[PDB]
Amino acid sequence: TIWYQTNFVVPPDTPTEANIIALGAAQKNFTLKLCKDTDEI
Amino acid sequence: TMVGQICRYYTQWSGSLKVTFMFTGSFMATGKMLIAYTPPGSAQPATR
Amino acid sequence: NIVLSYGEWPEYCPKPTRPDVSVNRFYTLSTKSWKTESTGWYWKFPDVLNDTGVFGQNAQFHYLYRSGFCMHVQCNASKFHQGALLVAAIPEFVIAASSPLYPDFAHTNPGKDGQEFRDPYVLDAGIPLSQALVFPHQWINLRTNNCATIIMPYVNALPFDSALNHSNFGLVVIPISPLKYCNGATTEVPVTLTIAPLNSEFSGL
Amino acid sequence: NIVLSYGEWPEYCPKPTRPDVSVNRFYTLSTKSWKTESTGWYWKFPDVLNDTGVFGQNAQFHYLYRSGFCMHVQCNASKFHQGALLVAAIPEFVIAASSPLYPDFAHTNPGKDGQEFRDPYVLDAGIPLSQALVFPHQWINLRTNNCATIIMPYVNALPFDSALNHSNFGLVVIPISPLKYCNGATTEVPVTLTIAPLNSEFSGL
Amino acid sequence: NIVLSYGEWPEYCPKPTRPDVSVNRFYTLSTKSWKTESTGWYWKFPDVLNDTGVFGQNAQFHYLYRSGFCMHVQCNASKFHQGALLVAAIPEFVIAASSPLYPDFAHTNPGKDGQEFRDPYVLDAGIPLSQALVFPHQWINLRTNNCATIIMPYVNALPFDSALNHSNFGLVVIPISPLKYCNGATTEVPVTLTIAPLNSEFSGL
Amino acid sequence: VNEASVEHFYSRAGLVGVVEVKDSGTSLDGYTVWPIDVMGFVQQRRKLELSTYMRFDAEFTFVSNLSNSTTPGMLLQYMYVPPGAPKPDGRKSYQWQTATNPSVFAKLSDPPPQVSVPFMSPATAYQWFYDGYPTNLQYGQCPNNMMGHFAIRTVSESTTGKNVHVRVYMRIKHVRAWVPRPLRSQAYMVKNYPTYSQTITNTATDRASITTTD
């Protein structure tokens, strides 16, 4: 979860809303097993 | 994601994951976000 | 950069249990908003941690303890704001009542949300503010540094004492020079606080 | 700071002529203006250099060539603008048509002036954008860095191939997080590009 | 004197926390009264410790654990009483229902107060009692020894598993030869139990 | 440079309190009990609150005489009731003897008695500021600072006609001070509490403008 700790503070003449993007990835020890065909299509 | 797709091709997986954030706002802006993670056996927190 | 209170590092006192582990983590108290009209705040811990976390689970169920604190106060404001704060940790902080008779218990132990001064000039302890620099202090000056950090060891007559009665000391944040900002800027500059108890001990479950 | 595509430096392939000399100079393409409404651009070279300079004089009159590219994209904006770009070089980039049937030739080889995406979300190749990071990429984030640089070697099945048919790869600039600026600031943030072919070769005059 | 179950000592499995300290203390469950008519008891821990002590504070708030148990059963009776008990720790103990359809949840996890057998002859698992000696067991024979002690290591397929679902094993006390006493003697012979978890671990707060 | 030391700064002996027996006139009781209060005078109080924790041995003297400043020989019993022992009920009460209550028998004609009290507190030092409750009258009260009551009486047997004034001086030896505290600007209201008046008094005396000097 992502919580607001404090208010979002900006000096004058600045856009008031930002946008955050996220990036997922797997670490080194990630492993897979037992091949199966998928439903995506 | 990518790992999201090619984990649809395997029944079982395992291992740690990594999640990275960027901030697009203007150079002047300032603030604090509290990013909190909950272990899998519990409901999401009520308040910070 | 860092002010060791009274030139010492907190330490153990050579069976009291040493929790270590998860009471050494930072705690982030709610963020107070410093307005242009606002005046002062104070906390007076060991109080603030009595409810929160695993710490409060130790301090409520133990009859005696020893502890020391590392507290870190930082203030996020853009460069178009001015104003300055004074941050000081004043040991054995005993407040008073105004008269036209004792301070209500809400004023003696505020809790995690702090309290507002009625009269910041005299600290509402009766002593002048001009001299309050005699205690360990740090200047937060919004054109220079945004952070102030203090390490306060365990100062008290007895080796141990209980958390629910004697509040070892207190902490003040006073906006000595008020905040002004030109029109359109964000109206409130937030103040946050972080405390990480050091070398704690407990006894008498 | 610099992303070598696929961890290699372009190199010769040990009579093809090596021009060196004046085809190693930078070329500065026209400056695209990135608005708040604007979406995407792409180029797909060897195309872009077919008309320009002495390079186009080599690529039009030779039946075969080998080449590699160093491309540099930078974006000038003051500190009161926000927004971010994604810059990626996607080899063998084949576009598609929407249906309510093939892409018009103006969309296949735009030329030195690039082209606008019809559907940036799917890249207009059908593949999602969320995964397009699998290609060599760099983030231009207007609060941090204004420049992105890539070196892409020669990737293709045959050792040599002609410039007028097979376009070795393509390049995309997608404003993933749109641009916003407070009133009065300059309305358009310019984007420029620079390419300097490396280790080129030609044969079959 | 002591029966190591399956000839092993429980041990750690080389970040899970090792509580040690105060979860290594004995716990004394309530004292069951063995009458002349009474038949059987069983417990099935990790259950019995879920409410009690600091242990239950670990097992309820952790998603996984590993543990091993040392259990000690003793029976105080004067020398004018006869009768004998069988004490056995039967791993993976799954009970059943009689028919003229599943066992009620009060019969699956009794809690700290144990439960009475409906049919001790078949153990109410369907298997005969005559063969139940195949599990680690000890004879409490009121003319010889009044105490029985068992150490049961951690036996389960997975390395770790949760305390609120899989109950690693169970324990039975069956008065195989009934109690008789001449008139005037105390009517009930008390049975008590003591468990001291060994080498516990916990993870996933 | 030797008159700035904390040891010299608290040195000199001073008047802690004035007590009177007055057994002659409308009040015939014939004794008095004087709980030791170092804070007695607001001047001595403001120099002590400079430091928060301090550890010191005390030394006393009793200068006594009649209402004429005339000192005829007549006997007095100065008793020291240590902290935690019962006080005398009346001039003949059996507490006046006991054993454990140290006493000083001195005629008026003699030069003044003098005596040395050790450090009585359980804690390693006194506390002039104790936050928190001892267990709202209670807030900020040190139970552990009581030094004893110095009960006095005149042995002569029944109803002398002479009211006897007596003064009590204290001086602080071997003093050691800990964490310093800023001096008090506001006036005092009551004895045991910091409480200060509503209307605030400025610290500096005002002048005409930010500019003019003298």
Are the C-beta atoms of residues E180 and E82 closer than 8 Å to each other? yes
Task: Residue E99: count other Cβ atoms within 10 Å of its Cβ.
Answer: 5
C184 contacts in chain A (CB < 8 Å): 12-13
Q: Given an 8 Å threshold on Cβ–Cβ distance, is C76 in contact with B34?
A: no
F119 has a chain C CB within 8 A of its CB: no
Compute the distance between CA of residue F186 and CA of residue F196 in angstroms, rounded to an integer: 6
Residue of D84, D181, D184 with shortest CB distance to A15: D181
Residue length of chain B: 48
Q: Is A41 helix (H, G, I), strand (E, B) or coil?
A: coil
Q: How far apart are the first and last CA of chain C?
A: 39
Q: Using CA coordinates, name the residue in chain D closest to B25.
A: D82
Compute the distance between CA of residue C4 and CA of residue C11 in angstroms, rounded to an integer: 13
Distance from CA of B3 to the nearest CA of D (A): 10
Residues 6+ apart with CB under 8 A from B47: none
Are the C-beta atoms of residues C178 and C142 closer than 8 Å to each other? no
Are the C-beta atoms of residues F104 and F112 closer than 8 Å to each other? no
Tokens of E150: 């068992």
Are the C-beta atoms of residues F52 and F127 closer than 8 Å to each other? yes
Tokens of D13: 């392939």
Tokens 């008793």 correspond to: F79
Are the C-beta atoms of residues F75 and F154 closer than 8 Å to each other? yes
F152: nearest Cα among F59, F44, F41, F18 = F18
Please, after which residues is chain C broken with C–N above 2.5 Å?
14, 100
D183 has a chain B CB within 8 A of its CB: no
DSSP 8-state code for residue C17: B
Q: Using CA coordinates, name the residue in chain C closest to F194.
A: C96
Q: Looking at chain F, list the stretches that DSSP marks H as alpha helix, in order from N- to C-terminal side.
A: 6-9, 42-48
Compute the distance between CA of residue D139 and CA of residue D144 in angstroms, rounded to an integer: 10
The resolution of the experimental structure, rounded to one decimal in Å, is 3.8
Chains D and B touch (3+ CB pairs under 8 A): yes
Q: Given an 8 Å threshold on Cβ–Cβ distance, is A33 in contact with B38?
A: no
Q: Given an 8 Å threshold on Cβ–Cβ distance, is B28 in contact with C78?
A: yes
CA C40 to chain centre: 12
Compute the distance between CA of residue E42 and CA of residue E30 in angstroms, rounded to an integer: 13
Q: Given an 8 Å threshold on Cβ–Cβ distance, is C77 in contact with A12?
A: no
Compute the distance between CA of residue C70 and CA of residue C9 in angstroms, rounded to an integer: 10
A27 contacts in chain B (CB < 8 Å): 15-18
Compute the distance between CA of residue D29 and CA of residue D173 in angstroms, rounded to an integer: 14
Are the C-beta atoms of residues D150 and D5 closer than 8 Å to each other? yes
Q: Is F96 helix (H, G, I), strand (E, B) or coil?
A: helix
Q: Which amino acid belongs to residue C20?
A: D
A3 contacts in chain B (CB < 8 Å): 33-36, 48
Compute the distance between CA of residue E83 and CA of residue E180 in angstroms, rounded to an integer: 7
C193: nearest Cα among C9, C33, C4, C68 = C33
Q: Given an 8 Å threshold on Cβ–Cβ distance, is B32 in contact with A6?
A: yes
Selected residue of D180, D186, D189 to mutate for chain A interface (largest A Cβ count, 10 A): D180
Task: Residue C92: count other Cβ atoms within 10 Å of its Cβ.
Answer: 23
Residues 6+ apart with CB under 8 A from C47: C109, C110, C111, C167
How were these coordinates obtained?
cryo-EM
Strand pairing partners for D91?
Answer: D169
C160 contacts in chain F (CB < 8 Å): none
C186 contacts in chain A (CB < 8 Å): 7-11
Are the C-beta atoms of residues A19 and B33 closer than 8 Å to each other? no
Task: Check whether the bond before D46 is cis (ω within 30° of 0).
Answer: yes
Q: Using CA coordinates, name the residue in chain C closest to B34.
A: C28
F45 contacts in chain C (CB < 8 Å): none
Q: Given an 8 Å threshold on Cβ–Cβ distance, is C127 in contact with F181?
A: yes
Are the C-beta atoms of residues D64 and D204 closer than 8 Å to each other? yes
Residues 6+ apart with CB under 8 A from F192: F141
Tokens of D162: 């002609």
Q: Cα separations (Å) of E111 from E49, E107, E170?
A: 8, 9, 12
A18 contacts in chain D (CB < 8 Å): 82
Q: Using CA coordinates, name the residue in chain D closest to A11.
A: D80
DSSP annotation string for D44-72:
-TTGGGTTSHHHHHHHHH-SEEEEEEEEE
Compute the distance between CA of residue F36 and CA of residue F16 in angstroms, rounded to an integer: 8
Residue of A23, A27, A39 with shortest CB distance to B20: A23
Q: Given an 8 Å threshold on Cβ–Cβ distance, is C126 in contact with F185?
A: yes
Q: Given an 8 Å threshold on Cβ–Cβ distance, is B34 in contact with A19?
A: no
Q: Given an 8 Å threshold on Cβ–Cβ distance, is B32 in contact with C79?
A: no
Measured torsion, CA atoms of residues D89, D95, D100, D106, in degrees rounded to the nearest 10: 110
Q: Which amino acid belongs to residue D24?
A: N
Compute the distance between CA of residue E151 and CA of residue E139 in angstroms, rounded to an integer: 15
Q: Given an 8 Å threshold on Cβ–Cβ distance, is C102 in contact with F194?
A: no
Compute the distance between CA of residue B3 and CA of residue B21 in angstroms, rounded to an integer: 17
Measured torsion, CA atoms of residues D104, D105, D109, D113, in degrees rounded to the nearest 10: -70
> Looking at chain B from residue 10 to 29, which residues have their Cβ under 8 Å from any Cβ of chain A?
10-26, 28-29
Compute the distance between CA of residue C57 and CA of residue F192 in angstroms, rounded to an integer: 35
CA C111 to chain centre: 11
A10 contacts in chain C (CB < 8 Å): 78, 185-186
Q: Cα separations (Å) of E112 from C81, E91, E200?
A: 64, 18, 19
Q: Given an 8 Å threshold on Cβ–Cβ distance, is F200 in contact with C105?
A: no
DSSP annotation string for C133-157:
GGSSEEEEETTTB-EEEEEE----S
* Residue E124 Ramachandran class (φ > 0 left, ψ -120 to 50 alpha, else beta): left
Compute the distance between CA of residue F66 and CA of residue F76 in angstroms, rounded to an integer: 12
E205 has a chain B CB within 8 A of its CB: yes
Task: Residue E101: count other Cβ atoms within 10 Å of its Cβ.
Answer: 7
A17 contacts in chain C (CB < 8 Å): none
Tell me the CB-side half-sphere exposure of residue C151, using CA atoms within 13 A: 12
C182 contacts in chain B (CB < 8 Å): none
Q: Given an 8 Å threshold on Cβ–Cβ distance, is B40 in contact with E205?
A: no
Q: Using CA coordinates, name the residue in chain B closest to D178.
A: B24
Strand pairing partners for A4?
Answer: B33
Selected residue of A4, A5, A9 to mutate for chain C interface (largest C Cβ count, 10 A): A9
Q: Given an 8 Å threshold on Cβ–Cβ distance, is B29 in contact with A6?
A: no
Neighbour subunits, B (≥3 Cβ pairs < 8 A): A, C, D, E
Q: Is the dihedral of CA E45, E49, E51, E57 positive or negative?
A: negative
> CA angle E176-E178-E183, nearest 5°?
165
Q: Is the dihedral of CA D127, D133, D138, D139 positive or negative?
A: positive
Q: How far apart are the first and last CA of chain D?
A: 39
B24: nearest Cα among E48, C77, D85, D93 = D85
CA E131 to chain centre: 18
Strands (E), chain E: 3-4, 27-28, 32-34, 41-42, 64-75, 84-91, 137-141, 147-152, 169-177, 189-195, 198-203
CB-neighbour burial class of residue F6 (10 A; exposed 0-12, middle 13-18, buried 19+) = middle
Q: Cα separations (Å) of D50 from D73, D93, D179, E183?
A: 20, 18, 33, 117
Residue-range domain boundaries for chain D: 1-205
Distance from CA of A15 to the nearest CA of B (A): 7
CB-neighbour burial class of residue F60 (10 A; exposed 0-12, middle 13-18, buried 19+) = buried
Compute the distance between CA of residue C146 and CA of residue C85 in angstroms, rounded to an integer: 10
Distance from CA of B46 to the nearest CA of D (A): 30
CB-neighbour burial class of residue D88 (10 A; exposed 0-12, middle 13-18, buried 19+) = buried
Task: Residue E161: count other Cβ atoms within 10 Å of its Cβ.
Answer: 17
Q: Which CATH architecture has domain E1-205?
A: Sandwich (2.60)
Question: What is the H or E stretch that residue F54 is in?
Answer: strand F53-65
C76 contacts in chain B (CB < 8 Å): 30-32
Residue length of chain F: 214
Question: What is the H or E stretch that residue A24 is in?
Answer: strand A20-26
Measured torsion, CA atoms of residues F182, F185, F186, F192, in degrees rounded to the nearest 10: 40
DSSP 8-state code for residue B44: P
CB-neighbour burial class of residue C102 (10 A; exposed 0-12, middle 13-18, buried 19+) = middle
Strand pairing partners for C71?
Answer: C150, C195
Tokens 């008695």 correspond to: F113
Residues 6+ apart with CB under 8 A from E73: E87, E140, E147, E148, E149, E173, E191, E192, E193, E194
Q: Given an 8 Å threshold on Cβ–Cβ distance, is D143 in contact with B25?
A: yes
Residue of D79, D84, D130 with shortest CB distance to B24: D84
Are the C-beta atoms of residues C137 and C73 closer than 8 Å to each other? no
Compute the distance between CA of residue D10 and CA of residue D199 in angstroms, rounded to an integer: 7
Strand pairing partners for B12?
Answer: A33
D70: nearest Cα among D99, D45, D39 = D45
Residue length of chain E: 205
Q: How does strand C64-75 pair with strand D41-42?
A: unpaired
A11 contacts in chain C (CB < 8 Å): 78-81, 185-186
Q: Given an 8 Å threshold on Cβ–Cβ distance, is D131 in contact with B27?
A: no
Tokens 């937030």 correspond to: C190
DSSP annotation string for C27-76:
EE---EEE-SS---EE--TTGGGTTSHHHHHHHHH-SEEEEEEEEEEEE-
Q: Given an 8 Å threshold on Cβ–Cβ distance, is B40 in contact with E204?
A: yes
Selected residue of B26, B32, B33, B34 to mutate for chain C interface (largest C Cβ count, 10 A): B32
Please, after which residues is chain F broken with C–N above 2.5 Å?
135
Are the C-beta atoms of residues F64 and F70 closer than 8 Å to each other? no
C204 has a chain B CB within 8 A of its CB: no
DSSP 8-state code for residue B45: P
Q: Given an 8 Å threshold on Cβ–Cβ distance, is C76 in contact with B28?
A: no
Task: Check whether the bond before C46 is cis (ω within 30° of 0).
Answer: yes
Q: Given an 8 Å threshold on Cβ–Cβ distance, is D176 in contact with A18?
A: no
Q: Could you tell me which residues of chain C have a Cβ less than 8 Å from any Cβ in chain A?
A: 28, 31, 33, 76-81, 182-186, 188-190, 192
Tokens 């951690």 correspond to: E154
Task: Report all structural domains of chain F as residue ranges with CATH numbers, in order of start.
Answer: 1-214 (2.60.120.20)
DSSP annotation string for E165-204:
T---EEEEEEEEE---B-TTS-S-EEEEEEE--EEEEEE-
Q: Looking at chain B, list the stretches that DSSP marks H as alpha helix, in order from N- to C-terminal side.
A: 3-6
